[model samples]
Target: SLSHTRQWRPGVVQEVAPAGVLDLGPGYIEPALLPVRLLRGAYEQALAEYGAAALGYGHDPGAQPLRDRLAARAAAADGLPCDPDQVLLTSGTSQALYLLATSLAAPGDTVLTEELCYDLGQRIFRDCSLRLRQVAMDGSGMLPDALDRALTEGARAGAKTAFVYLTPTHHNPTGHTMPLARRRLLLEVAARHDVLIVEDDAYTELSLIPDRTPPPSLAALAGYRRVVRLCSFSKTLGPGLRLGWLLADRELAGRLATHGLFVSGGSLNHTTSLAVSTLLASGAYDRHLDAFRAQLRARRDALVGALRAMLDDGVELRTPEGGFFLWLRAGDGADERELLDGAARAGVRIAAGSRFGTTQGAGLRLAFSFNPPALLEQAAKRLTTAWS
Candidate 1:
């Protein structure tokens, strides 16, 4: 007998062993917590009900069944009107980013992003031959003035800004959620300049704070004009499903769906889409979320609480309402290199803030999503000693 955390067993796809690393590095869920049983049953049920449709290619815009459910969920959650035609299924946020990068803009086009963002997203855009400029942000996430100035200056510099990429809702690495007022201000700036915005709401549904939902998305505030909002199950559900969707206005959605890739391959992950539809329709997904959020909340509180007990005025921390990461920073002008080296020597792995971008001092992004409360507390203790 074997456990998920300790060793890697041979599987259809080989998994690399953790090599005894107490990793707080990746913003990913522990394998033991992945709903393996639920997905197994869901897939079996999909085959039984859909029969041949479950095995065949999906509709070009994605299966109508899943799209309808996703739209209704969005509308209800945001208190805004959403239609199935406004949604386009994607394999995941990574693929969606790539698709937008290749299709929407060309080489030498510029993409404005937060000073610190999802590093991998930046890499993808850069690989697409798009130059990225970092926009300054404050406690409320990206600053509207900073964005406005960047867009204005970029145009004057003769650079065609493809779009502004942001993770405004429960932002990654920083754990800052932009307020509704700020969302509107950003939208107004973009609309005035007619620049497109890519809104990444990957961790939107994972908010752990009770009755404290983040504000309406930029897309909702803009009435879905020139904003592409990406949502993912990769954070909440299993990433292996490789399933997510993007919402836009009906016209943009239709145009995106008609791309040559969709025309040739129908949709990405056709069978998985049908399986997820079954879960949503039967309310199993919501029930799972209730339990899942409870789990993440416990882990989050454990990490933050323990760290606070151990640290002093030398550090500043931002307690996030919901989302996977906990951002910890040292006092002004403190460097992180010494602390990072110390953690590695102690067999603890943490993400350096510099990986995302420049910070006021030294910073670390520890993910509570990857470990249990006990392990997180232990990791926090190790970091406290190392940093102290």
Candidate 2:
């Protein structure tokens, strides 16, 4: 198994270079998983179908065709009402976060987040001069009572509360999906405090389990009021597309689309949006997701199963039903640095838990999304021996 898998070793530092380590670190889909040929056809077809329109600057909000398709996809998935007017396209979640951080919150405003969260998001707020306050959370997600207390005290302390940031669906790092009950509880608390919520649903569609459906999004449950859902194609599709959108109340969406950048540049990733839209409309995208899901499942299982079987006594981890990460927690006596040193010495690389804010316990994030199944298995064997 290892000999065959060794051929898949990363050689060149193309878009990403891990050097020689078995990189179970970044949550990136393998290069072969990218649909180059499929996207090529879609872009070519879009140019042919729309002719000059495809090449021209898109409408300010976004091309109506793409928005309609995205809106419809959301509506169908949630069984709720969604309209094209509620959609505002952006380059991706990072861009959307930047726009909101600047547009919605002042420099001195404070944003509340899970004690552990997507680290890049926290960096964005700090870079924008907005302060971030961490709230205590459980496995389900942020505790409603804790959130309420934070909002109340934040306002009392003369700190204007901007919004609460959360990644409820297949949450990054932990891979914990907030249940419906938790979602409603959090929404209720937010509404009482009159604070907005940013639902980062970036990895919701990437769940690998077949019948294990994640709960409806926070935005869907909130009826798109006081909640903005940020989604992207970076994880599922190619990151190079630089395409994603946010779903908000119609008024909010309209106001955001009128921002100076949108007014000046028309739409975000106009040509790419049209190309993806063609794929969505023709059902090519769904077919791709089905196949992609299967491959991800295999990769995920290869890493998780081997680790579970080989390193049974030294660590603790749950097989995540979805998403790219398997958070491996160390027992009480385990030193994080000791664990990392061992793995590195054994030619394996993993993400330190400290990178993603606070953690429930000492842990490391191992990503199955980047490597092939055989490579993942080989990594698991090495990690097992090192950790043991």
Candidate 3:
């Protein structure tokens, strides 16, 4: 444990919570779950296979092998055609969002998003001088009627709405997935308004429940028209890898690849891309995913089941079929900051709901992916005591 602590210290990893504190704040995978041995072998295999070319700058759209593999897998899953030309490798979702914010949309344009969203995304939009206008959402995720009204109102006011951003599958904090019917409705509304849809599908591959599949992606449902679907290996593999991809219609994909960043840098994270592509080619990725999903399932069940049993009726805990967070909403008039402070006082770190966006009431996010089932169970008990 001392050696492990040394390896995961502040400078090495992004952030570290203090010792003896049960941290449920960041959306991160526990370090033990990361496949270090598997990735080491993958990098060795890639080096042997590609030789010096493995270190060379990759094709602008990404290496053809990885793009083809990703495209094939997407087509098989969605039952819709996907071409290699329609895929572009990215450093990760964060980089992809920045790419879109700078290349696709102008600075003053507005981005419509779910009322509660990934807070960092909002920051990225703001840093780029893009406006964020949140559309109201419920259990089924963002409402189509509200979206139509927002778009119509924007149009009336001569606002150039840039795009609609959505996390339809295994959403970050809330964990509410948009139903298929609602997806189609929103797509129709976006099409009617001639707006673009940016589907952040980062957590789609992390579904924890057995025999329960997520709804079709907005990009697939829209036949890859006017929609960009972003996916990443960050959640499933490791964020340190910093590898992801975006799928769009061939024309849009091609145009985006011509951006100065891509043209100058070639493939982002080229060597890492080849290493991951080796994993995909040898079917190691599937093997890792199977084990990772089961681990996530155990962690989520441990946290959610314990919270449900221990917490009083005022706290509303909804079980998410997938993803890292369990969004807990307090009764009406509950104060968000107080909830966070109470948890902090109990030596448990948690995320305030308002950090994401507007919430219906006091809320908080507990991330199950960063701790073991035992620790998660302990955290739940601590939270129950704190909130009570």
Candidate 4:
């Protein structure tokens, strides 16, 4: 008789099968599996030149070369005239957010954000004991008018709002990039309120409309004096590099560096630094980014087309200007949680809309990254099948 729950499976089925199942949740890239080629080159250069000493603990801020490269790149890309002294490298963008949560906010301080924002940012602010206040936003991006009203009201109430966190370029979850005029207006308002602006630009380089990329970041507009910009090569290159940087005033950069020293005890690897430095120096980084962006745009268009073809009147989809996700809205009677489970059972997964928002407008966030062209089509098909 055929055995049930057998320990082994036939042929390549057992060998190739996933440990559990596919997860379509979260925005992640399938990294170059042979990144060791880059690592090997860095290692060989280090051995032939600086030896094992080069692999030792780097400066708490980061290696000088890496910091210099970051500053130069920022100046060219964002128009922020940066210096190595003003750049602080962190393990990842998440760590940068954690550092900002500690350094910039205090218990009971009110931090402002968009109603639908990055989930991790909310979690970090809450963990730091800061009270989060969200401002409503629209297609043009976070409403400056609403933000101005909130700040004025907060001031009248004798409660000060500390900082406003924004992802103006290819905003997470929504993918609605703020326009240049709106960005300038936002900086002006923040100045009027004398509040800090934490500008997260993780997906700045992934703009599908290359010529229309949102104006040089608000931090650049604010001149890095009032706005702290957090950026990373993770989104453009690969996340495993675990490298990100904060562009801020010299004083804030110094303070964050001190805090980083205590937090990680300077455990960041220099080998990764060497790999990134090499890529930047050789211009491979820019070439790779261009190719990646083109691929992303194709995948995004395909997914959007699929959603349009599948969903009827009850569902609404927001097509992103750029970036890896599409925000979808379901009808009043639709249950987002049930949809998620059904999709998972069908070998597809997606982030529930409620996770990105605090109130109604139940929906889903489907990431178009990670999967190849064929896989993305299959995933979209699976989602439509489950939803219908």
lDDT of 2: 0.87
Q: Estimate each model's TM-score.
A: 0.96, 0.95, 0.97, 0.85
Judged by lDDT, which candidate is best? 3
Candidate 2: 10-residue stretch with minimal lDDT = 1-10
Clashes of 1: 0
- Please give the clash total of every predicted structure, in order: 0, 0, 0, 0
lDDT of each: 0.88, 0.87, 0.90, 0.75
Candidate 3: where are CA atoms >4 Å away?
Answer: 1-3, 310-312
Q: After superposition, how far is residue 55 of candidate 1 from its true place, in Å?
A: 1.1
Instruction: Give per-residue lDDT, candidate 4, residue 170.
Output: 79
Identify the runs in model 2 with alpha carbons over 4 angstroms from their true place.
1-15
Worst 10 residues of 4 by lDDT: 1-10
Instruction: Give the Å error, residue 245, model 4.
Output: 0.3
* Displacement of the residue 134 alpha carbon in candidate 1, Å: 0.3
lDDT of 2 by residue, 95-118 (tens): 999999999998989999998889
Sorting all predicted structures by TM-score, with the top scorer first, yields 3, 1, 2, 4
